């Protein structure tokens, strides 16, 4: 069984500017966000999953029950809210974010020491890869 618990450091962030543009993030804020290399701190506790995206600019925290649709507040990302469901798809974790934007969601999986995160909106695809790490720092 797949367990995402751990601390993960960003290695690559591919096509993030177009993903942000598709979310209508303003130009000045895209400049800031494109420089960020956030960590992921994940705790999988039964079906309760916490995914913290940690950066020097701000943190974005997801805290949900797998399988249960919830109102996700993305105010700090693109000023939207979505009805979001995160579910298992075999060994992958799928997120569908229903809202104003078509085809918004993400897929997360592990390969070896890598956390893979593919983020999608309106036919744009952004791919991030993080490496599992062990030196922890307070947040
Ligand atoms: C404008 O500032 C942002 C825009 C997008 C992202 S982000 O795309 O890395 N981010 C994590 C993945 C997801 O949760 C997927 O829905 C969206 C939010 C983030 C920020 C600022 C701080 C942390 C991350």
Swiss-Prot record:
Species annotation: Homo sapiens
Reported impact of residue 108 to L: Strongly decreased affinity for retinol. Further decrease in for retinol
Tissue: Detected in nearly all the tissues with higher expression in adult ovary, pancreas, pituitary gland and adrenal gland, and fetal liver.
Keywords: Cytoplasm, Lipid droplet, Methylation, Retinol-binding, Transport, Vitamin A
Subcellular location: Cytoplasm; Lipid droplet
Impact reported for residue 29 to A: Decreases cellular retinol uptake and impairs retinol storage
Assembly: Interacts (only as retinol-free apoprotein) with STRA6.
InterPro entries, per the entry: Calycin, CRBP1, Fatty_acid-bd, ILBP, Lipocln_cytosolic_FA-bd_dom
Segment forming the signal sequence: none
Domain notes: Forms a beta-barrel structure that accommodates hydrophobic ligands in its interior.
Record-stated family: Belongs to the calycin superfamily. Fatty-acid binding protein (FABP) family.
Pfam families reported for this sequence: Lipocalin
Alphabetical list of SUPFAM superfamilies matching this protein: Lipocalins
Main location: cytoplasm
Gene Ontology cellular component list: cytosol; lipid droplet; nucleoplasm; nucleus
Identification of the protein by name: Retinol-binding protein 1
Annotated GO MF terms: all-trans-retinol binding; fatty acid binding; retinal binding; retinoid binding
